[PDB]
Every structure is written in structure tokens, then in C-alpha cells.
């Protein structure tokens, strides 16, 4: 259904913006699976840290909970109305696609909580409380790096995925197509040619007589 | 005047074909993907048409039932089958609902079960306009009830695993021979139907 | 740009006692809702941790990070392992008593296929 | 009947268009990967390299019977479900798998 | 003048690249995916559509005018914002617009 | 000698075309794509050739014209454009430079300004040498001071909106008469090359 | 020997493996972006631009030799580190940097 005299001239176009959209696509792919495997090892090695600095401050939070002899949660439940540490959402992306970062404030005017000065657990209980956010904070920075590391391996199969389907559908049907309309022309072109020559011989033998 | 035209080089841009397929008013086309699965012959909706089937919907319709909403309904399905194919293809099929694949597996069921009519007997390859508007009506039956039964809320494999013998029973119809029921109106697409729609309600909750 | 400053927790009662004296998370006033589900050792139930991290992962947009114990996601290994997407992101660390185990992380199972 | 089984043309039949629906699930699955790989596609993809990797072998001189092929051939066909198979006849399926 | 609407011809300028750009667009988002299209491309394809299934949508023995084309024609065109259109003038695109 | 060519076969492989092409000495562009899009009469940065340019040039010299300046910058930033819209349309949009968008942006404007002719524009009776070559000034100054703003430190969203008006006013510039305030110079270039230092000061503080 | 420069065919692929990889690096630098783009694909950018139109850029009516054009081509491959040079001998290297 293509067109038989000059169609290859657009296919040629087609074919090589195609085999420099695969080759981008092959390349971005390979930076991207190439940044996603030290992110994972980095998102590893942090859940790791993360995990063993959350099992300390988790030990230390129920050794201070169970030394204190009462309900430190439904009091720090129910004292807890508003949000001391939050977090910043920022866009820093150094990839292909854009990254997700979080950066850590607390607020000044939020002080500690009112949940001290029940004699020897109050002390205990800030103190519990200080460290608990200390270590809450390098663990929201240690964990901050999943939403960028879960969007580079979200991305790193859709350009693997559109690269090798393109890369394996864009050559063939042109390829093909502008083989079989060379040939055509060529036989167009013969099949003129072959009947040209019987048309001159006939006024060569005639034009040979005057 | 029926009369059958293959290419002399390989192609179809011949004189003898698209002289003979522009003179003519139908048109029978041939797929190559769809006759290497022994499926003689291969009749797509995008390489197919007529226009004398609505003048013959009118007599169909009269001594018969309603083929020409099934026709257009399974042009229809077999049109967004054919674009959803090639992008369940070359995107993939993280791309795509559940409603698609119900229509993809029904127009691949209905174009496998409809598209072989050689078969190993006398039974599978002479088939009734009653036993293929029966056998379209509940393809097209069962395709609807679970496009809305889907939209309420369910999953694609819950719901395709779900049917079982269900969609089967359908397509095991072409191997009974067209001598069953009355003369020639098979009475197991009444009971599928009621089975279909009786599945439909338990496929939603 | 920043849309969420509130971090939810989904832990035991030490580590979510923990997290909520540093102030990670708080209790809204527009609903009286809290932004953490305190898990009880024997206490409650799958349906409610799964409500709560259903609630907590697409019926609320101020959260940031979603946090999760390997305990705790074990039973919501199903919800946890369906949920992909990075709004809110999702981080599997280990639980109090419990050591790190690869089995438990959700996006070490995706991330390991075609790697 | 009497030089080749009677059910030979079905299974060659199911074997032909199951050879296709697995090359086409092989090349749909080679693009696609494992992210969005269908059901039907593992299986047609196992049988078409267990049918090519079996059946297409064989040596320049060692003989083989349609009989024995036929019996190979249903078994490697066997993998596939009962709703998948719907250009057979039901005698022949529930004879033989 | 007289017979016709003076924007009916400025009109098609658009309405021809709009036709192109949702051809286009919706040639892209089968052969890239729905990942690499763009804002334009989104209301192209709806432009497309809606143009292709509304202006060549009508009978065959229903007469039709210039002015309920260029009226009919005239709604599908507002899908997008007046920033977005080049081929008409602003004086006699905001007298019909 | 102006001849135009016709198609004779083949978009560019035809007889006449080719045997007229070799013999002929100013070639200019067509866009095929644009040409069905209602932007005639269109040309084509990649395909032409001139040889009276640098004869030309010498008369250029002497009459103090500064259009083969602005038409290289002009004819590299539509070359660029291209290649911009190419592989922001193949690769995705996802991620690009200010320097790629102000200059798509100034091949907008120049496109709108240059390319819409013929019932695109009130005046089109006249069109002098002064004109031409003063208005791709204003386009050329506003690509070089933008790039030249985002080079020294600028986000793109503030250059954009710190430009305002004056892209409107460049843009709708070509409506306007050149026998307002001289008899071969506009006001608004005067104009524009004062506002454009304040618009480029603006832009990058 | 005698009639022609030493380092003018390590200059020449130099400049050529410098030209691919400014291109491809100019190529990948729209899709990577400005603020994502590494420092090869900027540091051949660079060299690209300014060998585009340092090396190719000539007079209508100024002749220049090989020996100018190798000594224009070294200054342009100057900006590249002696780490990063690995198509030339280190002596030919060394003195002419």
C-alpha cells in the first residue's frame, strides 16, 4: 500500500531517527540501570544501618518504657498533637528522570513534650525522647533515598521495555518495504526499457533505409 | 461470481488483484499470521467488507435473528482487538485495563474458534447462520457482562479463570454437528447464556 | 514542590512510642485522626493494619515516607507487595527483636528481577 | 486409519497453531520481558522450545515413527489446559490428554 | 462574503494542524507508549477523536450548511486555550471564539 | 528567472526537478508536512543553497544591511529546532536545557512571523530590506539575550516571564507598517532596543 | 617523513574520536538535560563546538596549511587532560600538548 517511486527517501529518515531513538533509549537505559544498582546497594547498606540503628533506639525506647513502670505511649499519644520533626519534599534529580528528595527541619518554636517530671521516669523519658529523635532523624535521612530509588527501578523498565520493543519492531518493516519497492521500480524501470527497445528497433530498421 | 486471485512476484500490488478487488463490491482478505495457525480462511474486519449485508439484514432479521447487530458489534470488538494487539504488543500489557483484555481474548477466541472452518470432520466446517449468531450473541453476551461486571470492581485473571468451562463450552459448540435442537437452533446457548449471566452476578461481588 | 511534612509509622509500641515522642508523626484536628497506627503484639488484627496502611497510602497525601516493620509488613506482604508506587514511598527496616532479612523488602523483589 | 492414528490431525492441527501462538508469545515475551508476560505465554513459550528442542531434533539416520511422534506429541500438547485447546474434538481430548 | 463565513478558510488552517498533530500524537503514543507524550499531545488525540467521529459524522440524505459546519466545527476547536493557535488572525479568531 | 517546479513522479526524485536543480543557482526549502498544515509558503533550513550571497554581500557591505547575520542565526536556530523537536517528540519529553526551549521558543516566534505569510499578516504589499533585516534583530537580540541570561545565572520561568510583553510585541510586530515614525524604520524596533535592556537587566536580577 | 607531519594521523583520529563522542555526548545531552549532563559528554561538547568552527571554519581567500591545521587542531585538543589522550606516542604528546 506504499507508494512505489520515491518512498525510501522517507523510510531512510524514518529508520535512522528510529536507530538514533533505540541507541538514546539503549544508552539512557544502561545510565539508569548503571545509577539503579548503586542505589540499590546504597538502599541496602542503609536499610541495613538503618534497621540496626532503629533496633538500638527501639531497645533503648523499651528499656526506658519498661524501667518508667507505666503507659509512656498513651501518654505520648495523647500529649502528641502537632508534628516537632517534619520533613521538606524537594526535587533534585541528577538522571533521566526526576528523583524525589527530603530534607529534615524542626521547628523552634516546637519544644519537647510534656511528658517529665513524674520523679525518676521524667528524665529518663526526655532523654528517651532526645535520643529517639536523634536517631529518628539519620533514620529519615538514612530512608529518605527509597522514593528516588523506587522511581529510577519504575523507570528503568519502561526505557528497557520501549527501547527493546522499539529497537526490535523499528527495523524490519521498513527494511523490508524499501527493498520491495527498489525492486519494484527496477522492474518498473526494466519493463519499460525491454518495450523502449522493441519500439526503437522497429524505427532504427526503418530510419536504416533512408 | 466468486473468484480467488493470488499475487505472480510475491506482493499484493498486482493488475489482477487490485484490478479484480477494485471492480468487485466484497472483499475477502487473507492474514498470514492468522493462516499459519491453520485457519483457512482468515477473515479480519480491516480487510473485509460489504455492503450488501445491510440489505440482507432486513430478510436475516426476519426469518432469522438479529445478525446484523452482532456483525457490527464484532466489527466493532474486532476493530479495538486489532489497536489493542499492537499496543498490547509494543507497549506491553502494563499499559492496558482490564476491559481490554476481556475484548483481546474474546475477539481471539472468536477469531480462532471462527476462523477455522476446515476442522478433522463434516461437523467443523458446515455451520448454520443461527449456530454462529447463537455462538456470537453469547461471545458477545458474555464479553459485555464481563466488561461491566469488571467495571464494578474485579480482576482480568479472576475473571477469565473464574468462567472456565464456561468459555470453553462456547467454543467446543462448532465440534457437535448442526442436526441438534430443533433443525438447525442448537438449545445450548439458551442454557450458556443463563449460565453467563448467572456467573456475571457472581463475578461482580 | 512540598506537599507533605508527616511521616507515618507503622511499628511496634517501643519504636512507635519512639517515633512519635520525636515527633515524626501527630494527631490532625481537622478530623481527629491520628497520622500512625500503634501496632499491639497480639492485639490486633491483619485487617486493621491493612486498613490503616490503605488509609494511610492512598486516602492521604501528607505523608511523606510510609514506615513499615518486617514483622508487621510479613502479614501485609500481599497489600505491601502489590503497592509500588513512590507517593508515599515505602521502607521496609527491621523490626524490634528481629533481625534484616531480604525476603521481607518489598522493592528488593522487584528490583531483583530484571536487574 | 489403517497406515496413521486417527487423532494425528488434530494434534497436528493443535501442535501447528500452538508452534505459532508460541512463537508469538516468544517474541511477545522477549520485548516485553517479565514485567507484563501473560499466562499463556510461559506455557506456549515452554512448549514451543520443548517441541522445537524435541521434536525438531533428530539425527541424519535414526529412524522415527509417526506413532511414537504422535505420543510425544500429545504429551508435550498435555501441558496446555482444557479451555486453551478448543480445536479438537471432546472424544479425542477426553481420550487422550 | 455572502455565501460563506470569512473565518471557514482560517479555520481549516488550524483545524489541518491539529488533525496532523493529533495523527501524530496518537501514532507516538502506540509506538512510544502513553511515557513520552507530551500536554499537547493529550489534547491533539482528544481533538482528534473528537474531530474525526464529529465533523465526518452525519447521514446520507441530511443536508448540511456552511454556517452549522463552521458553528459545529467551531465547538470542537475549543479543547485547548487561545495560546496554542497560530493559523488565524487574533482579530477575526476572537470575534468567533 | 523564477521557475517553479512541479511534481513529475517522485517527491524529489523526478526528471525535472533533478536536471533543473543542477543547472539552477538560488535553491528553497518546502516543507511537506507543513505544506498540508497550513503554513505556506514554507521552507526548508536543511535543504538550500544560494551563490549570490557573497556578491551580494559586497553591496550589502556598502548599503549597510545586516540580513545575512540574523538569516545564519536564523537559518541555525530553525536547524537546531528540528533537531530539538525531534528528539523531544522520539526520546520524551522528561528532562532538557533552557538553552533547547528558548531556542524552539525563538523558532516559534520566528516561524509564526517568517513562515505565516499570504493570508497570515495585514501587511503584505511591501516589504523592505530595512524591515526585514530590523526585525530579526529583535528575535536574534532576544534568543542572544536570553541565552546569554541563562548562561550568566537565570531560571527559565524568570526569563520567560520577565520578558512579557515584549514577545507579544516582537510577535505581533509584523502587522505593523514600517512608515510609522520613519519612512523605512518602525517605532517598536527603536523601542525594542531599548526595552530589550531592561527586559534582559530584568530578566537576569 | 619529509613531506608531511608526524602527529597528523593521531591527530586525526583524535580529533574524530573527539568529534563522535562531542556529538553523542551533544546527543545525549538534550535527553540527560543541563543540570544531569556528565563532564565528558560536556568537556566533547565543547570541543565540538569550538572544533566545528576552529578546524572547518576557513577563509574564502586565506590558504591554510596541514601544519596551521595540526597546530589549530592541538589547541583545540588541549583542553583535554594528558589522562584522557591515548591516541598519540608520549613524546610527540609531551611536546606538542
Request: net charge negative; proline share 3%.
Amino acid at each position: 500500500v506504499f507508494p512505489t517511486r520515491m518512498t525510501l527517501g522517507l523510510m531512510k529518515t524514518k529508520l535512522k531517527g528510529a536507530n538514533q531513538g533505540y541507541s538514546l533509549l539503549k544508552r539512557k537505559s544502561e545510565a539508569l540501570t548503571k545509577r539503579f544498582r548503586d542505589i540499590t546497594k546504597r538502599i541496602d547498606d542503609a536499610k541495613q544501618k538503618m534497621g540496626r540503628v532503629m533496633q538500638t533506639a527501639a531497645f533503648s525506647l523499651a528499656e526506658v518504657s519498661y524501667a518508667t513502670g507505666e503507659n509512656i505511649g498513651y501518654q505520648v499519644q495523647e500529649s502528641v498533637s502537632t508534628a516537632r520533626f517534619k520533613v521538606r519534599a524537594r526535587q533534585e534529580n541528577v538522571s533521566g528522570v526526576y528523583l524525589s528528595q527530603f530534607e529534615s527541619y524542626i521547628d523552634p518554636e516546637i519544644n519537647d513534650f510534656r511528658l517529665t517530671g513524674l520523679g525518676r521516669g521524667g528524665q529518663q523519658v526526655q532523654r528517651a525522647k532526645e535520643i529517639y529523635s536523634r536517631a529518628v532523624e539519620t533514620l529519615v535521612e538514612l530512608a529518605s533515598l527509597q522514593t528516588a530509588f523506587i522511581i529510577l527501578d519504575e523507570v528503568i523498565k519502561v526505557t528497557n521495555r520501549r527501547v527493546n520493543a522499539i529497537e526490535h519492531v523499528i527495523i524490519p518493516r521498513t527494511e523490508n518495504t524499501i527493498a520491495y519497492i527498489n525492486s519494484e521500480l527496477d522492474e518498473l524501470d526494466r519493463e519499460e526499457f525491454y518495450r523502449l527497445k522493441k519500439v526503437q528497433e522497429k524505427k532504427q530498421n526503418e530510419t536504416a533505409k533512408l | 461470481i466468486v473468484a480467488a486471485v493470488s499475487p505472480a512476484g510475491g506482493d499484493f500490488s498486482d493488475p489482477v488483484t487490485t484490478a479484480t478487488l477494485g471492480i468487485t463490491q466484497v472483499f475477502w482478505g487473507l492474514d498470514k499470521k492468522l493462516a499459519q495457525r491453520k485457519h483457512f480462511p482468515s477473515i479480519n474486519t480491516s480487510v473485509s467488507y460489504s455492503k450488501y449485508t445491510n440489505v440482507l439484514n432486513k430478510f436475516y432479521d426476519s426469518n432469522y435473528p438479529e445478525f446484523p447487530v452482532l456483525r457490527d458489534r464484532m466489527k466493532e470488538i474486532l476493530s479495538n482487538a486489532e489497536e489493542l494487539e499492537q499496543v498490547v504488543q509494543l507497549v506491553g500489557k502494563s499499559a492496558l485495563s482490564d476491559s481490554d483484555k476481556i475484548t483481546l481474548d474474546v475477539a481471539t477466541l472468536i477469531k480462532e474458534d471462527f476462523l477455522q472452518q476446515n476442522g478433522y470432520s463434516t461437523y467443523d466446517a458446515f455451520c448454520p447462520i443461527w449456530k454462529t449468531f447463537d455462538m456470537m450473541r453469547a461471545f458477545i453476551s458474555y464479553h459485555d457482562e464481563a466488561q461491566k461486571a469488571v467495571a464494578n470492581g474485579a480482576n482480568w485473571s479472576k475473571l477469565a479463570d473464574s468462567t472456565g468451562d464456561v468459555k470453553h463450552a462456547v467454543s467446543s459448540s462448532k465440534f457437535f454437528e448442526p442436526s441438534r435442537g430443533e433443525k438447525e437452533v442448537h438449545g445450548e446457548f439458551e442454557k450458556l447464556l443463563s449460565t453467563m449471566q448467572e456467573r456475571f452476578a457472581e463475578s461482580t461481588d | 514542590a512540598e506537599k507533605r511534612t508527616l511521616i507515618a509509622v507503622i511499628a511496634d509500641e517501643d519504636t512507635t512510642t519512639g517515633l512519635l515522642l520525636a515527633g515524626i508523626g501527630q494527631i490532625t484536628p481537622e478530623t481527629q485522626e491520628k497520622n500512625f497506627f500503634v501496632y499491639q503484639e497480639g492485639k490486633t488484627t491483619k485487617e486493621e493494619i491493612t486498613d490503616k496502611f490503605n488509609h494511610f497510602t492512598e486516602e492521604r497525601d501528607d505523608i511523606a515516607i510510609l514506615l513499615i516493620n518486617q514483622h508487621i509488613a510479613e502479614n501485609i506482604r500481599a497489600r505491601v507487595d502489590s503497592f509500588t508506587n513512590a507517593f508515599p514511598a515505602i521502607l521496609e527496616i527491621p523490626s524490634k527483636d528481629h533481625p534484616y532479612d531480604p525476603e521481607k523488602d518489598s522493592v528488593l523483589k522487584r528490583v531483583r528481577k530484571l536487574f | 486409519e489403517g497406515m496413521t492414528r486417527k487423532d494425528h490431525g488434530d494434534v497436528s492441527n493443535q501442535l501447528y497453531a500452538k508452534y505459532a501462538i508460541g512463537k508469538d508469545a516468544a517474541a511477545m515475551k522477549a520485548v516485553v520481558g517479565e514485567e507484563a508476560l501473560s499466562i499463556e505465554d510461559k506455557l506456549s513459550l515452554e512448549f514451543l522450545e520443548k517441541f522445537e528442542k524435541t521434536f525438531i531434533t533428530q539425527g541424519a539416520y535414526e529412524d522415527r515413527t509417526v506413532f511414537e511422534s504422535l505420543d510425544q506429541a500429545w504429551s508435550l500438547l498435555r501441558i496446555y489446559p482444557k479451555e486453551m485447546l478448543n480445536r479438537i474434538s471432546p472424544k479425542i481430548l477426553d481420550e487422550f490428554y
